[PDB]
Write a protein that binds this DNA or RNA. Structure first.
Ligand SMILES: [Ca+2]
Ligand SMILES: [Ca+2]
Lengths: 255, 248
DNA sequence: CCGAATTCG
DNA sequence: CCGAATTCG
């Protein structure tokens, strides 16, 4: 990452299924091999557990880890050392979660710009649609509260169905979904796919765009450049790093 | 002056079913209504009614599984025809059962249904309600239309549906929303489902369309409120007894 | 047939 | 962690 790429932020967002203990160390090494290949500035992770933090400190030592909780399972934001200056951590609760979910925010400077970087793992399953929608509103409300000079990026596992974003009232006028921005490309549309991914061993074909990237920037100051899936290679154990595909995204920050 | 009972009699609950069926009819005997709208009837229950209620003409919504029925008191009600309207996307064999009848010079179209069940099937239930309301509008203006049945509705779903049309009224609302007969399915007062919690809903509803003011609800009461010898009620639902006057 | 929880496909 | 069918409190 040299002079030319200095105006770009690159990141990966990925629910890495830390609650599946089977093959977890090898699957962590798989995630870390992906981070080594693309060397993203930032990594947004969901379903991290404490042993997984240890694996990351070993196989992704060039990242500072900021976590959404101390025990159970939680999100984390990883920051590339020497590229990202960490300014503060903020955690916003979801008072009605039944699954210890919350909103993790990290304030940083990168490439000579101020960012508020957000992630969450919104309430899971169709049956908890109401709370998931309430949490999305909390997220979208927080994105709007940041100073107008700050660049806000949310990236996480939203567990959203399309009908739910409408029921939520659609995205506010100044908040954009990166996948939509890039013209809804088919190659990275689905991030959870039980036909293509066998980690859950579900004997049926269902697929969802659970993982999403939202951003709020002053008119034209933040331009998504690319969006691609990662984590599609089977590991030596014959499974994938996670039941989710990860998303690799690059964005330019423009005057 | 006409009377009727509408009641989901829970024919799919096999426990104490003979005693509960006899319990339902003991209740019908007490009030001897002109018309009875039933939901969740099963074939042997239907077979029972043809004997026990042999004094009623019995019209059914199906022959198999579970289904609705409309009983018409011979002498009082003249049966002219039955019509069944399908719900193409039902997953529960639900449909719309109508009968054309007269009492004196007064023509009626009487309708019942058991709308798609459970919170998860709200969207189909709403679609079925639109079909029902649509049908109510088709009758001649001189024909009095009454729907009475188990709608499984939540109030929000009626709103979602667009609300009742200007010329269709809910009898319970018309009577000023009396508290004593508001909830027709109540797990606190009713123990048949053995649900260890308190939920209550107004699932059973009466809708009518008449030329302005021709049909005036007079009373509405719950029935089936007494435990049977087995310590359970005739059904998990209360029945609704309604009396209305035809005013020309 | 409530909401929540559970197996198995 | 899908979703339909089933069981539980
Ligand atoms: Ca998971
Ligand atoms: Ca029933």
């Amino acid at each position: 990452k040299g002079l030319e790429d200095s105006s770009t932020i690159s990141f990966i967002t990925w629910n890495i299924d830390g609650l599946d203990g089977c093959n977890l160390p090898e699957r962590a090494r798989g995630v870390c091999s992906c981070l080594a290949l693309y060397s993203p500035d930032v990594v947004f992770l969901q379903e991290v557990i404490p042993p997984y933090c240890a694996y990351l400190k070993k196989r992704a030592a060039s990242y500072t880890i900021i976590t959404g909780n101390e025990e159970g399972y939680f999100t984390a934001i990883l920051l590339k050392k020497g590229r990202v200056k960490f300014k503060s951590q903020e955690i916003i609760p979801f008072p009605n979660t039944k699954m210890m979910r919350n909103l993790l925010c990290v304030n940083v400077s990168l490439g000579g710009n101020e960012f508020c970087l957000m992630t969450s793992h919104l309430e899971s399953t169709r049956e908890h649609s109401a709370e998931r929608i309430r949490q999305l509103k909390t997220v979208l409300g927080k994105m709007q509260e940041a100073p107008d000079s700050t660049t806000v990026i949310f990236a996480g596992d939203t567990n959203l169905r399309d009908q739910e974003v409408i029921k939520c009232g659609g995205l506010p006028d100044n908040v954009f979904d990166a996948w939509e921005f890039l013209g809804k490309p088919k190659h990275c549309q689905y991030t959870w796919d039980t036909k293509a991914n066998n980690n859950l061993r579900i004997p049926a074909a269902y697929k969802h765009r659970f993982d999403r990237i939202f951003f709020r920037a002053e008119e034209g100051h933040l331009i998504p450049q690319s969006l691609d899936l990662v984590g599609l290679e089977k590991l030596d154990c014959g499974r994938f790093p996670s039941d989710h595909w990860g998303l690799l995204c690059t964005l330019n920050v423009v005057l």
